[PDB]
PDB file of C-alpha atoms in Angstrom:
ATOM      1  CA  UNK A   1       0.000   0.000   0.000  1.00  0.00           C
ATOM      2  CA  UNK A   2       1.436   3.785  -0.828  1.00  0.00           C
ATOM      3  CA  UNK A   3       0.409   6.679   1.048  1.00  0.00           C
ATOM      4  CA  UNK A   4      -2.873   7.694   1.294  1.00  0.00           C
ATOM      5  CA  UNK A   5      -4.055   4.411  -0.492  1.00  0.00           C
ATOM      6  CA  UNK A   6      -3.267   6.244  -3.801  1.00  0.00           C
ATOM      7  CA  UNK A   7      -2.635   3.347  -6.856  1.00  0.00           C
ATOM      8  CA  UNK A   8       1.425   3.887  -7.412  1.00  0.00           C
ATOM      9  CA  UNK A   9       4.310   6.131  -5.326  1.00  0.00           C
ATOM     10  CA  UNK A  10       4.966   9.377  -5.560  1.00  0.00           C
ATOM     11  CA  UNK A  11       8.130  10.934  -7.165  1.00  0.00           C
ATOM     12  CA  UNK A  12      10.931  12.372  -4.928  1.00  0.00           C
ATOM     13  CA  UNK A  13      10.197  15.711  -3.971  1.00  0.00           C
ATOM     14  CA  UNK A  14       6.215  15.169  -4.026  1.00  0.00           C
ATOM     15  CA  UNK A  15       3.366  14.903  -0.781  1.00  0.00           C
ATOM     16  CA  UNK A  16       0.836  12.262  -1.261  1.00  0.00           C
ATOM     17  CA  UNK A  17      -3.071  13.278  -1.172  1.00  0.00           C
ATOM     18  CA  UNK A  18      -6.288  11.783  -1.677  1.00  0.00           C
ATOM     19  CA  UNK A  19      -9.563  13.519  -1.298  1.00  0.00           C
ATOM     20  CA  UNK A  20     -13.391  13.033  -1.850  1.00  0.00           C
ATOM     21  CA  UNK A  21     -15.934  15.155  -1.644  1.00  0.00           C
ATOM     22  CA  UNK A  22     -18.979  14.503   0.669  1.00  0.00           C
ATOM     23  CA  UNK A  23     -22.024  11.905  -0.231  1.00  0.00           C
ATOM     24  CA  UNK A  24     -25.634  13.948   0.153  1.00  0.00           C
ATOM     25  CA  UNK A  25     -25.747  15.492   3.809  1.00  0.00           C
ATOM     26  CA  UNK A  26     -24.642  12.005   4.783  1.00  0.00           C
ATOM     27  CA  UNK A  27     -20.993  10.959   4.485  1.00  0.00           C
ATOM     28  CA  UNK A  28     -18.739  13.830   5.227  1.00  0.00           C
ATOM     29  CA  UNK A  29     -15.361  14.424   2.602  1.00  0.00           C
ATOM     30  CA  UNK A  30     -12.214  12.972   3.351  1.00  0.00           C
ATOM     31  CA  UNK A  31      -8.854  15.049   2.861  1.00  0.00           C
ATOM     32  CA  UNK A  32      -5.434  12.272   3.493  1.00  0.00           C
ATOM     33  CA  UNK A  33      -2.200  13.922   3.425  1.00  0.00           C
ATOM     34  CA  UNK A  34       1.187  12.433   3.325  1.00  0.00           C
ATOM     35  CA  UNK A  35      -0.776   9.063   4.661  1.00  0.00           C
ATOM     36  CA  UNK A  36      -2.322  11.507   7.761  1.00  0.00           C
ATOM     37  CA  UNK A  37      -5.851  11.542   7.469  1.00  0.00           C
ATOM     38  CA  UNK A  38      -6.241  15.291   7.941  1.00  0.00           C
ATOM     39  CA  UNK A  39     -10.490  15.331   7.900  1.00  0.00           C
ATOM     40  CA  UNK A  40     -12.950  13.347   7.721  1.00  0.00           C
ATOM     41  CA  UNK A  41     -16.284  11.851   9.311  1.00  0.00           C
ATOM     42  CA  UNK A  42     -14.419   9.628  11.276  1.00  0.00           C
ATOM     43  CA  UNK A  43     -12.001  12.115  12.635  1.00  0.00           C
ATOM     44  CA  UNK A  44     -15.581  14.172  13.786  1.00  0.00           C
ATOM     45  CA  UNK A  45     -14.054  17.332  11.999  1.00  0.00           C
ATOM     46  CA  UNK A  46     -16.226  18.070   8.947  1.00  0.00           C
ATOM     47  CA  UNK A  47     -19.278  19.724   8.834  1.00  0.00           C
ATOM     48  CA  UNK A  48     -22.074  21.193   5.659  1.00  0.00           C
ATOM     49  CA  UNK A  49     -20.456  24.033   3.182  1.00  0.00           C
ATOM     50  CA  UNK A  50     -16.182  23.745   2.355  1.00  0.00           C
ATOM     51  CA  UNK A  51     -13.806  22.345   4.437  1.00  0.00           C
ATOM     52  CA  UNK A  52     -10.524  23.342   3.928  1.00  0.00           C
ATOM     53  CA  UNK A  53      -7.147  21.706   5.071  1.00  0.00           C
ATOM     54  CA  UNK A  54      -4.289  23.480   5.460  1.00  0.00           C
ATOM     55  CA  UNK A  55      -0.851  22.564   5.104  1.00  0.00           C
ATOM     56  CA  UNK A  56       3.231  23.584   4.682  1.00  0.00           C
ATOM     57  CA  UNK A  57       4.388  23.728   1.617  1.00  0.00           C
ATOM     58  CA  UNK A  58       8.238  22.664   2.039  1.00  0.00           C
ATOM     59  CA  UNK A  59       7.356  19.953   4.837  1.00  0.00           C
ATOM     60  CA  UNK A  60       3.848  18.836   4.198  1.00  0.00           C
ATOM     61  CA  UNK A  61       2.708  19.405   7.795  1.00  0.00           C
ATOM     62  CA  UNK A  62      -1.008  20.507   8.701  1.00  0.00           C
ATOM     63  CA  UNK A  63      -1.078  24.064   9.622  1.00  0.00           C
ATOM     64  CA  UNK A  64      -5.031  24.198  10.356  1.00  0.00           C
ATOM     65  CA  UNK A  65      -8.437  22.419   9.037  1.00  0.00           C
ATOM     66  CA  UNK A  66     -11.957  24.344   9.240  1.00  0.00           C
ATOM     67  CA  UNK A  67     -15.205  24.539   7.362  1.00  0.00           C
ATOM     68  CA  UNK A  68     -17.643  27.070   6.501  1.00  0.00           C
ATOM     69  CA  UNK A  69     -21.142  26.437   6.068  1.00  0.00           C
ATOM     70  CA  UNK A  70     -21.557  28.231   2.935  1.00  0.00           C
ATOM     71  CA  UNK A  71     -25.656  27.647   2.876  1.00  0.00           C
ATOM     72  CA  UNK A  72     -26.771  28.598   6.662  1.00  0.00           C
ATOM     73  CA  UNK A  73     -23.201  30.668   7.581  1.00  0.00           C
ATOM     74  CA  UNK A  74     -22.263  34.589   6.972  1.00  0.00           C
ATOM     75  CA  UNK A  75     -19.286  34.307   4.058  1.00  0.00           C
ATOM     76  CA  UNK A  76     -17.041  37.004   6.428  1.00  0.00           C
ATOM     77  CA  UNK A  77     -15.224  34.555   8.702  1.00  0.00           C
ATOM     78  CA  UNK A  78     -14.681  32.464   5.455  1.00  0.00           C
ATOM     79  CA  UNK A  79     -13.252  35.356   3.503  1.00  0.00           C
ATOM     80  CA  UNK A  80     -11.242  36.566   6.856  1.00  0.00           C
ATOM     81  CA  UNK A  81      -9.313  32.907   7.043  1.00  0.00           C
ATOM     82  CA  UNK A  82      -8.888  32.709   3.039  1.00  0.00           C
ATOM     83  CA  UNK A  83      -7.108  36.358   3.311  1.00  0.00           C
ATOM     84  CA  UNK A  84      -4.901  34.854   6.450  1.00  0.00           C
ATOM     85  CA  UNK A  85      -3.714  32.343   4.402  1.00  0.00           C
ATOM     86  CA  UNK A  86       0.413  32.858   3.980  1.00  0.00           C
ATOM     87  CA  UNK A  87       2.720  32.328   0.774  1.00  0.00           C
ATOM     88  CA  UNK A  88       3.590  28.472  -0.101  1.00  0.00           C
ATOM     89  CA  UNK A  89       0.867  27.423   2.154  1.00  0.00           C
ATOM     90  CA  UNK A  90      -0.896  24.130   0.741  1.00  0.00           C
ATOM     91  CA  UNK A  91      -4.554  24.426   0.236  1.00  0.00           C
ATOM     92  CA  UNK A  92      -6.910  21.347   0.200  1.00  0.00           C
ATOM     93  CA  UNK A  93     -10.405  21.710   0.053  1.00  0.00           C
ATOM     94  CA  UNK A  94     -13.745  19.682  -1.072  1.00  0.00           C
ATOM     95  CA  UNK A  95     -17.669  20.356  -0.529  1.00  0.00           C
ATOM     96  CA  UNK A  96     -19.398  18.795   2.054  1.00  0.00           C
ATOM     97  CA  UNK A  97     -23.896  18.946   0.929  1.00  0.00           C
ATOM     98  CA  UNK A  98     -23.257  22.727  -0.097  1.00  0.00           C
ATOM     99  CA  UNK A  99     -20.418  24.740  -0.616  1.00  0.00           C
ATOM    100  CA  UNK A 100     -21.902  27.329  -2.998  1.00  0.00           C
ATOM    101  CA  UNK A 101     -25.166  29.494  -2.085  1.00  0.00           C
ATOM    102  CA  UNK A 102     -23.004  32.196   0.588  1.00  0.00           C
ATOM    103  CA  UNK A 103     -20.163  32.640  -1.778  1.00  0.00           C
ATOM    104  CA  UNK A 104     -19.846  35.769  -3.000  1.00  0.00           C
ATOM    105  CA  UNK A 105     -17.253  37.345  -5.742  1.00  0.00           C
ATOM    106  CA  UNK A 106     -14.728  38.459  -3.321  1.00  0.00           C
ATOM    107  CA  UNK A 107     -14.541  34.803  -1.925  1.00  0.00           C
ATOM    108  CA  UNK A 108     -14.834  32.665  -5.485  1.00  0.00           C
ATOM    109  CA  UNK A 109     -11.647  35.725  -6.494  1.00  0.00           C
ATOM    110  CA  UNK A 110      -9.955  34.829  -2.987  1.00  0.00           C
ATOM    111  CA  UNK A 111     -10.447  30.978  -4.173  1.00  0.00           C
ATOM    112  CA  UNK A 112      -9.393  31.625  -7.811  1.00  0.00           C
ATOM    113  CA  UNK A 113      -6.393  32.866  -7.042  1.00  0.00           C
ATOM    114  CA  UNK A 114      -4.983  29.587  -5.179  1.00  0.00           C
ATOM    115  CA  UNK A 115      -5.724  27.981  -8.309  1.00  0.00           C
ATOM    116  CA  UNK A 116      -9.424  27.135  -8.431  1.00  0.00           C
ATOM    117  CA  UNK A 117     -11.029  27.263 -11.736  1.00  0.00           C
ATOM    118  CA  UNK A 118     -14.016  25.762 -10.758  1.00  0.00           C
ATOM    119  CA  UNK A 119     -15.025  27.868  -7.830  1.00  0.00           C
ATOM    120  CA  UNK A 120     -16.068  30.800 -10.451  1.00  0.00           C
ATOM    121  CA  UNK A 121     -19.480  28.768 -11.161  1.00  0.00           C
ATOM    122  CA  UNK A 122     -19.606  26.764  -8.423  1.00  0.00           C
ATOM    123  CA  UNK A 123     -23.855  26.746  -7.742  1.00  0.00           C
ATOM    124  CA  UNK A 124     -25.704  24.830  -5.102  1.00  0.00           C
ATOM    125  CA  UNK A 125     -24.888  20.959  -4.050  1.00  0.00           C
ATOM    126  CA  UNK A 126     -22.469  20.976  -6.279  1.00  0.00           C
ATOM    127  CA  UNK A 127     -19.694  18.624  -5.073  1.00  0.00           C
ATOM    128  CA  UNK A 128     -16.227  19.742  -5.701  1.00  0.00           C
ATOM    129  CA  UNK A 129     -12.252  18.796  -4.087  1.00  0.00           C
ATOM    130  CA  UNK A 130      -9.538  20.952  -4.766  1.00  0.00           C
ATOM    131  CA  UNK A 131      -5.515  20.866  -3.747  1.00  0.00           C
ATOM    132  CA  UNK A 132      -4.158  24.249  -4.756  1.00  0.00           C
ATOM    133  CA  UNK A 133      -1.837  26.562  -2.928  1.00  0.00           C
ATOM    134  CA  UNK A 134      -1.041  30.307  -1.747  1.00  0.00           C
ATOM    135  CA  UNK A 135       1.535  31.950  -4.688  1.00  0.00           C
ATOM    136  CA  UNK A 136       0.416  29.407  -7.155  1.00  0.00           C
ATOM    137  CA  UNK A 137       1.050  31.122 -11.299  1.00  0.00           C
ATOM    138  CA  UNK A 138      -0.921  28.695 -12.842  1.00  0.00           C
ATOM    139  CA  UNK A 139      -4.645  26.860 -12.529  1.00  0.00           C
ATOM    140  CA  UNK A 140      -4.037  24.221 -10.394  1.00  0.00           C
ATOM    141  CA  UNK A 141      -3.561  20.503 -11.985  1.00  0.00           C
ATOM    142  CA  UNK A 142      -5.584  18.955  -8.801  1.00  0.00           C
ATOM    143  CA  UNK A 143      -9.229  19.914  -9.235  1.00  0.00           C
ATOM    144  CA  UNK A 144     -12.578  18.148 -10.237  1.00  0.00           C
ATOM    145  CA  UNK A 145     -16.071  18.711  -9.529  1.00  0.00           C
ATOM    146  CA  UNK A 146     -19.165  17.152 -10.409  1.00  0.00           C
ATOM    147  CA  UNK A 147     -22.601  19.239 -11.458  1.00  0.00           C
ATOM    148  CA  UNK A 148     -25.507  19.296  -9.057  1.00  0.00           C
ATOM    149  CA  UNK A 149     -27.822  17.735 -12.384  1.00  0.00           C
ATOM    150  CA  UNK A 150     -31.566  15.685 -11.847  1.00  0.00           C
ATOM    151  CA  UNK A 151     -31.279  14.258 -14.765  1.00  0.00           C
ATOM    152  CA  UNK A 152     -27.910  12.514 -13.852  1.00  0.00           C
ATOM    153  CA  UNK A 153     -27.468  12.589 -10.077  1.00  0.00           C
ATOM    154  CA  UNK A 154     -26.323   9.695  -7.990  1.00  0.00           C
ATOM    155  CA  UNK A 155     -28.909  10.871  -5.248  1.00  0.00           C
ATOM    156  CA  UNK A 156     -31.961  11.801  -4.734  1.00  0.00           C
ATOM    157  CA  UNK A 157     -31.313  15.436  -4.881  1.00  0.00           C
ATOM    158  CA  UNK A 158     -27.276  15.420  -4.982  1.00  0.00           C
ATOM    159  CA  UNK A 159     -24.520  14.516  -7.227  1.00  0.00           C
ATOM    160  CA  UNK A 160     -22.400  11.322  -6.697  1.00  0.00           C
ATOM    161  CA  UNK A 161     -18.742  11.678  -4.445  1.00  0.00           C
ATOM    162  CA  UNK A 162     -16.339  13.122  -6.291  1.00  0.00           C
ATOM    163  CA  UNK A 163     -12.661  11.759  -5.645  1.00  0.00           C
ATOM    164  CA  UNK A 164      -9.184  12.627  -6.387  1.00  0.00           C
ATOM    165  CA  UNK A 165      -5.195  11.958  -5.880  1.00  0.00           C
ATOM    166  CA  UNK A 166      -2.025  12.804  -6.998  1.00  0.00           C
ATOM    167  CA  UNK A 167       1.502  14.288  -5.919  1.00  0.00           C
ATOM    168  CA  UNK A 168       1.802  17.407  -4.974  1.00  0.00           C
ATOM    169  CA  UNK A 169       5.359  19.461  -5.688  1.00  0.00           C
ATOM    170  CA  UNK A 170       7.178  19.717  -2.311  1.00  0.00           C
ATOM    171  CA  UNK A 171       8.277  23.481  -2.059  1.00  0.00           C
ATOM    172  CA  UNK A 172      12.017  24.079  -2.427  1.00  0.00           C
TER     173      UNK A 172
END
């Protein structure tokens, strides 16, 4: 087994992560880092709208993991830790039910800029995960999402888990 559970190593130089979305208002996401489980249901420290996992860029170690209910919650204390957020800082985040409905454009702009490309449309249920970073000059290359759609959701009113894993550059 390799860290995380992801299918082969990671190159020299590289952290480990595996993610997934939420399931419904049911099954809370799951952020692994470096083979540390850094949230998840199990851990008791996920909750409705994004959750967000923080982490050092040059040694991989959490900094701080919190999540803002983005349909029942005020956006300010989301926007307020998104502008703390300091250079080369690791940013891992997924949806959790809803991450959408309290965003406004100063937060989806806050989000964009770690790399998000997704986060510009995001709209309500829709399940996203996300590994970007603070200083990033490109889109990210970790990010997928799946479309709150009737016509094709897993659920009865939600889209299926989205999932994702790779190797992130270790900071030099």
């Amino acid at each position: 087994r390799y860290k995380c559970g992801i299918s082969k190593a990671c190159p020299e130089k590289h952290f480990a992560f595996k993610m997934a979305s939420g399931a419904a208002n049911v099954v809370g996401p799951k952020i692994c880092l470096e083979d540390n489980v850094l949230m998840s249901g199990v851990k008791n420290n996920v909750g409705r709208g994004i959750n967000v996992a923080l982490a050092n860029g040059k040694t991989g170690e959490v900094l701080d993991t919190k999540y803002f209910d983005m349909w029942g919650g005020d956006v300010a204390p989301f926007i307020e830790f998104l502008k703390a957020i300091q250079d080369g800082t690791i940013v891992l985040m997924g949806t959790y039910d809803d991450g959408a409905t309290k965003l406004n454009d100063e937060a989806r702009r806050l989000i964009a800029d770690l790399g998000s490309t997704s986060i510009t449309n995001l709209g309500f249920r829709d399940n996203w995960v996300f590994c970007g970073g603070k200083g990033i000059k490109t889109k990210s290359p970790f990010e997928q999402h799946i479309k709150n759609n009737k016509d094709t959701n897993k659920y009865e009113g939600w889209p299926e888990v989205v999932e994702m894993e790779g190797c992130i550059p270790q900071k030099q």
